[PDB]
């Protein structure tokens, strides 16, 4: 199971906004958690791993933290090619489960 | 099938009662003598062998309550 | 507090060594101690949660069958082959039925013939393990000393739930005030895991130990099952009738979930819904109370005209509880708490409270004591004498060290040597008795167990028979050793 | 480079079963498991099974119990997914990638993470549609 | 439960197999020796009781093999 | 107790209740040594094929 | 005996003998079960409510 809530469900925001995400977990996650962008219909990309930490190659305008159950994900700058839809994961225990979702809109 | 080997003596006791709450040894002794009542000649040809065999009472009385109990 | 009417209570002396005492403690009871100072303190058990557990087996309960082929050579030309015996997810079994003409074939013999079923699978066993880590026990650990609300209720926050794992130490909690309380847990010493299993019907769970657990029937299935309906097994579960000569036929032999309770009675049983919430078993806390108060000194013997709002109220073996209410001008003073005797003072109870304190007003402070096993005259007030009361505990001092006794025999039944580290400050002969009663009860370990209540006492009996007849004084540790543990063994299990 | 490709859309009838392929480029192809992730396309994504490439173990979740096949090739380098007894809830699009590896078999969490799941090396998405 | 009293001896037969085919036997049998094999101590005790008391060697067999036996 | 809330802090009495719904039955059945019939085929040899 | 689908031949004694409750022939609006100490277990932990 662990079901994985993510808030909230949709947002829209203007160029060059900070927007954060939510993601709660049933259980202890502790720091089994990952942060995906996918635009719609195309190949989409991991942002964040371990919930705190860049990839090579993503810009840094992106960062994660949170430790037990609530997990903060973090966009300091918005920008254009951001409009996606944006998942949060849990890596523990297996019967593994994705967030919701959450689209962007840009204004 | 899984009607025996019925987890008995294999320990992990605890403080507290564990499934049937001692009615599954009052369940065995009540079926024991309810099938003794039901079957009075096997008993009796237990006695006959008890009273042949050993010849010493105790070891008598001992087998005696052992082919009792020999029923499955 | 938290520990009243929850009889089986565990009453704990001694605090020597400087500050470690060794406390046993289980779901079902709960542990009192005391010491010359620092006040006394109440440790119940609450849930124990094993977080992650990794799940080792599948067993059907129910099952149905479909697709029913079947074939037969020929009389001894042939043993009969049919390609729906290829999937092991088919049960197949081969016989030997006859032939003839009338059945149309030749030779006239006794030829073969296979039968075939397609298994599918209702309800099931989940059995799971869990490592000796992934699991916590809560402990809430209260003290005494006043605040209304109930002597008992568990629920509320007065005690603190203080968690422990095997991946933690020295349990450091606070109170309120002087309840700084040192834990060092040994959890690895407890229900010894890598030899449990929990098993989850449909809706309820069992611990049961892994041996029986895995040489048990109805029919085996790995934890990779996903795809796999793969049961390496099938001859304990669905039965093939034969009449005298002809087709034979394929019988499923129905839900074994009431065989299966009957298999594990003589187990103890675990709600597990929400992740787990493991019960009845016991942990071994050594136990440092250096840092602490008597929840103030500080203050004075106080005024008078206290109240009581509640009855005498005797629990189990001395531990009379008073409710009393104090008027006047406190400003939160201490209680004059006396158990005396009557005239030509002679005082002689304990305080099971120590330092009972009034705390802002009027609130209805309670105080808990010990007196002795007759007369006794509880005073509590001072200056015009104000309040005595008259208490008669029925009792004996022979019957208190006769239950006493009948408690420690308890003790060296159910806990195990645990129990022999259930004292403290012992030294030599409490670790040579752990010892020893550990290598002896380690070859009466296995080592003769596994038998039912009715066989203990009989082979109870019978030993303690040939113990009694007597050869060179070997009846002693024969008969007198052998039968009283085998006796007072055998009538305490299977609770 | 860091790459898989996967196979191309497919349209199957009720009842049937589909086969969508999942072949490696740019790494030595025993040192990844094989994650295969669904998504309906009004829902977001759901986890379906693990192959590992070295050996060959399986596992899947509940909601596939007994429908879904993964087997591989390992000369090819290729990952086939089997999904059988198809109804019109399976139209969706499929996806697979590479998890950072217990090195023997499949399924572990505790060594420190999988790592994504699973969109750094993982194709270009296979379209599979159920109708009659 | 109905686990056990399995309906062995009543009678009632005829020339045909009744239910289990000759596999209740075997059930039987594969189980005591399962048992035996899964707890040695009390195989070894049972020795030890029956080197004692009796002390004629077929008594001694005879009430070894029915301490095997005793197991519910 | 006075946990529970009642008083004299005792090991008092309780009793537990259910109602009873039943599935699927044994069934048994019990027949007079009449309204029983045996069916027997007698049947003569010497040829007729099939 | 009559199960689900199938039937038995047991003598009368044992049948008479057997547990899992008892019920006689003149049921149909009764259910009136007199057994179930052999079906339906209660669960008691160590001191509280069962
Ligand atoms: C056990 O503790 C709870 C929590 O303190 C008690 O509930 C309180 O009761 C007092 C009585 O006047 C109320 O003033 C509080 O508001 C209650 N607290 C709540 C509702 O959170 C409970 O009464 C105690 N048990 C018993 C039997 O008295
Ligand atoms: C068993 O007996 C039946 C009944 O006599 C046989 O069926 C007959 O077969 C012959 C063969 O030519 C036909 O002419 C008849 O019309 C059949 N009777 C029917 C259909 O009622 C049957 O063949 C015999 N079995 C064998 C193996 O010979
Ligand atoms: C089993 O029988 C059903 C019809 O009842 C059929 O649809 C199915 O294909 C059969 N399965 C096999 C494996 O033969």
């Given at each position: 199971?662990?079901?994985?809530?993510?808030?909230?469900?949709?947002?829209?925001?203007?160029?060059?906004?900070?927007?954060?995400?939510?993601?709660?977990?049933?259980?202890?996650?502790?720091?089994?958690?990952?942060?995906?962008?996918?635009?719609?219909?195309?190949?989409?990309?991991?942002?964040?791993?371990?919930?705190?930490?860049?990839?090579?190659?993503?810009?840094?305008?992106?960062?994660?933290?949170?430790?037990?159950?609530?997990?903060?994900?973090?966009?300091?700058?918005?920008?254009?090619?951001?409009?996606?839809?944006?998942?949060?994961?849990?890596?523990?225990?297996?019967?593994?489960?994705?967030?919701?979702?959450?689209?962007?809109?840009?204004? | 099938?899984?009607?025996?080997?019925?987890?008995?003596?294999?320990?992990?006791?605890?403080?507290?009662?564990?499934?049937?709450?001692?009615?599954?040894?009052?369940?065995?002794?009540?079926?024991?003598?309810?099938?003794?009542?039901?079957?009075?000649?096997?008993?009796?040809?237990a006695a006959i062998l008890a009273y042949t065999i050993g010849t010493t009472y105790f070891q008598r009385v001992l087998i005696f309550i052992l082919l009792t109990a020999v029923?499955? | 507090?938290?520990?009243?009417?929850?009889?089986?209570?565990?009453?704990?002396?001694?605090?020597?060594?400087?500050?470690?005492?060794?406390?046993?403690?289980?779901?079902?009871?709960?542990?009192?101690?005391?010491?010359?100072?620092?006040?006394?303190?109440?440790?119940?058990?609450?849930?124990?949660?094993?977080?992650?557990?990794?799940?080792?087996?599948?067993?059907?309960?129910?099952?149905?069958?479909?697709?029913?082929?079947?074939?037969?050579?020929?009389?001894?030309?042939?043993?009969?082959?049919?390609?729906?015996?290829?999937?092991?997810?088919?049960?197949?079994?081969?016989?030997?039925?006859?032939?003839?003409?009338?059945?149309?074939?030749?030779?006239?013999?006794?030829?073969?013939?296979?039968?075939?079923?397609?298994?599918?699978?209702?309800?099931?066993?989940?059995?799971?393990?869990?490592?000796?880590?992934?699991?916590?026990?809560?402990?809430?650990?209260?003290?005494?000393?006043?605040?209304?609300?109930?002597?008992?209720?568990?629920?509320?926050?007065?005690?603190?739930?203080?968690?422990?794992?095997?991946?933690?130490?020295?349990?450091?909690?606070?109170?309120?005030?002087?309840?700084?309380?040192?834990?060092?847990?040994?959890?690895?010493?407890?229900?010894?895991?890598?030899?449990?299993?929990?098993?989850?019907?449909?809706?309820?769970?069992?611990?049961?130990?892994?041996?029986?657990?895995?040489?048990?029937?109805?029919?085996?299935?790995?934890?990779?099952?996903?795809?796999?309906?793969?049961?390496?097994?099938?001859?304990?579960?669905?039965?093939?009738?034969?009449?005298?000569?002809?087709?034979?036929?394929?019988?499923?032999?129905?839900?074994?979930?009431?065989?299966?309770?009957?298999?594990?009675?003589?187990?103890?049983?675990?709600?597990?819904?929400?992740?787990?919430?493991?019960?009845?078993?016991?942990?071994?806390?050594?136990?440092?109370?250096?840092?602490?108060?008597?929840?103030?000194?500080?203050?004075?013997?106080?005024?008078?005209?206290?109240?009581?709002?509640?009855?005498?109220?005797?629990?189990?073996?001395?531990?009379?509880?008073?409710?009393?209410?104090?008027?006047?001008?406190?400003?939160?003073?201490?209680?004059?708490?006396?158990?005396?005797?009557?005239?030509?003072?002679?005082?002689?109870?304990?305080?099971?409270?120590?330092?009972?304190?009034?705390?802002?007003?009027?609130?209805?402070?309670?105080?808990?004591?010990?007196?002795?096993?007759?007369?006794?005259?509880?005073?509590?007030?001072?200056?015009?004498?104000?309040?005595?009361?008259?208490?008669?505990?029925?009792?004996?001092?022979?019957?208190?060290?006769?239950?006493?006794?009948?408690?420690?025999?308890?003790?060296?039944?159910?806990?195990?040597?645990?129990?022999?580290?259930?004292?403290?400050?012992?030294?030599?002969?409490?670790?040579?008795?752990?010892?020893?009663?550990?290598?002896?009860?380690?070859?009466?370990?296995?080592?003769?167990?596994?038998?039912?209540?009715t066989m203990?006492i009989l082979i109870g009996v019978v030993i303690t028979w040939i113990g009694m007849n007597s050869r060179?004084?070997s009846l002693?540790?024969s008969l007198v050793?052998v039968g009283?543990?085998t006796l007072?063994?055998?009538?305490?299990?299977?609770? | 480079?860091?790459?898989?490709?996967?196979?191309?859309?497919?349209?199957?009838?009720?009842?049937?079963?589909?086969?969508?392929?999942?072949?490696?480029?740019?790494?030595?192809?025993?040192?990844?498991?094989?994650?295969?992730?669904?998504?309906?396309?009004?829902?977001?994504?759901?986890?379906?099974?693990?192959?590992?490439?070295?050996?060959?173990?399986?596992?899947?979740?509940?909601?596939?119990?007994?429908?879904?096949?993964?087997?591989?090739?390992?000369?090819?380098?290729?990952?086939?997914?089997?999904?059988?007894?198809?109804?019109?809830?399976?139209?969706?699009?499929?996806?697979?990638?590479?998890?950072?590896?217990?090195?023997?078999?499949?399924?572990?969490?505790?060594?420190?993470?999988?790592?994504?799941?699973?969109?750094?090396?993982?194709?270009?998405?296979?379209?599979?549609?159920?109708?009659?």
């Amino acid at each position: 199971d662990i079901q994985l809530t993510q808030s909230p469900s949709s947002l829209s925001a203007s160029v060059g906004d900070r927007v954060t995400f939510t993601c709660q977990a049933s259980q202890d996650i502790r720091k089994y958690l990952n942060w995906y962008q996918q635009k719609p219909g195309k190949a989409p990309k991991l942002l964040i791993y371990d919930a705190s930490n860049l990839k090579t190659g993503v810009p840094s305008r992106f960062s994660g933290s949170g430790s037990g159950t609530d997990f903060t994900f973090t966009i300091s700058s918005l920008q254009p090619e951001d409009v996606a839809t944006y998942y949060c994961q849990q890596f523990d225990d297996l019967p593994i489960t994705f967030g919701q979702g959450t689209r962007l809109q840009i204004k | 099938s899984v009607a025996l080997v019925p987890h008995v003596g294999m320990g992990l006791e605890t403080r507290t009662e564990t499934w049937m709450s001692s009615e599954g040894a009052w369940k065995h002794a009540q079926r024991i003598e309810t099938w003794i009542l039901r079957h009075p000649g096997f008993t009796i040809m237990a006695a006959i062998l008890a009273y042949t065999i050993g010849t010493t009472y105790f070891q008598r009385v001992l087998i005696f309550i052992l082919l009792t109990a020999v029923t499955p | 507090m938290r520990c009243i009417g929850i009889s089986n209570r565990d009453f704990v002396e001694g605090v020597s060594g400087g500050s470690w005492v060794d406390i046993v403690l289980e779901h079902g009871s709960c542990v009192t101690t005391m010491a010359k100072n620092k006040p006394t303190l109440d440790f119940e058990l609450i849930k124990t949660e094993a977080k992650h557990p990794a799940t080792l087996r599948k067993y059907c309960v129910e099952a149905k069958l479909t697709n029913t082929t079947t074939a037969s050579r020929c009389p001894t030309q042939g043993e009969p082959s049919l390609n729906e015996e290829q999937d092991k997810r088919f049960v197949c079994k081969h016989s030997m039925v006859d032939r003839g003409w009338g059945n149309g074939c030749g030779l006239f013999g006794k030829g073969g013939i296979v039968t075939c079923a397609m298994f599918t699978c209702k309800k099931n066993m989940e059995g799971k393990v869990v490592q000796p880590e992934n699991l916590e026990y809560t402990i809430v650990i209260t003290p005494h000393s006043g605040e209304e609300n109930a002597v008992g209720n568990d629920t509320g926050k007065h005690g603190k739930e203080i968690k422990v794992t095997p991946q933690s130490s020295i349990t450091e909690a606070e109170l309120t005030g002087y309840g700084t309380v040192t834990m060092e847990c040994s959890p690895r010493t407890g229900l010894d895991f890598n030899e449990m299993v929990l098993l989850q019907m449909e809706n309820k769970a069992w611990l049961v130990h892994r041996q029986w657990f895995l040489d048990l029937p109805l029919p085996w299935l790995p934890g990779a099952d996903t795809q796999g309906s793969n049961w390496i097994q099938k001859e304990t579960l669905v039965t093939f009738k034969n009449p005298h000569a002809k087709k034979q036929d394929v019988v499923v032999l129905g839900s074994q979930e009431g065989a299966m309770h009957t298999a594990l009675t003589g187990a103890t049983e675990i709600q597990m819904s929400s992740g787990n919430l493991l019960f009845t078993g016991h942990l071994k806390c050594r136990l440092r109370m250096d840092k602490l108060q008597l929840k103030g000194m500080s203050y004075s013997m106080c005024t008078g005209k206290f109240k009581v709002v509640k009855e005498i109220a005797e629990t189990q073996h001395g531990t009379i509880v008073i409710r009393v209410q104090y008027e006047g001008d406190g400003s939160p003073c201490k209680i004059p708490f006396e158990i005396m005797d009557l005239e030509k003072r002679h005082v002689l109870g304990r305080l099971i409270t120590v330092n009972p304190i009034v705390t802002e007003k009027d609130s209805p402070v309670n105080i808990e004591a010990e007196p002795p096993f007759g007369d006794s005259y509880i005073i509590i007030g001072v200056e015009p004498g104000q309040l005595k009361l008259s208490w008669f505990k029925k009792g004996s001092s022979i019957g208190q060290m006769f239950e006493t006794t009948m408690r420690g025999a308890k003790r060296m039944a159910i806990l195990g040597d645990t129990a022999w580290d259930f004292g403290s400050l012992g030294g030599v002969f409490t670790s040579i008795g752990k010892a020893l009663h550990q290598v002896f009860g380690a070859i009466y370990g296995a080592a003769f167990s596994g038998v039912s209540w009715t066989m203990k006492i009989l082979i109870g009996v019978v030993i303690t028979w040939i113990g009694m007849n007597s050869r060179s004084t070997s009846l002693s540790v024969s008969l007198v050793l052998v039968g009283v543990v085998t006796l007072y063994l055998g009538v305490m299990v299977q609770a | 480079e860091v790459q898989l490709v996967q196979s191309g859309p497919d349209v199957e009838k009720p009842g049937a079963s589909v086969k969508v392929s999942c072949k490696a480029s740019g790494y030595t192809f025993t040192s990844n498991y094989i994650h295969w992730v669904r998504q309906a396309p009004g829902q977001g994504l759901e986890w379906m099974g693990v192959i590992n490439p070295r050996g060959g173990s399986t596992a899947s979740a509940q909601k596939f119990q007994g429908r879904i096949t993964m087997t591989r090739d390992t000369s090819t380098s290729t990952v086939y997914m089997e999904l059988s007894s198809l109804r019109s809830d399976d139209t969706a699009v499929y996806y697979c990638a590479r998890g950072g590896r217990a090195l023997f078999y499949d399924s572990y969490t505790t060594p420190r993470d999988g790592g994504s799941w699973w969109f750094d090396p993982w194709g270009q998405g296979s379209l599979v549609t159920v109708s009659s």
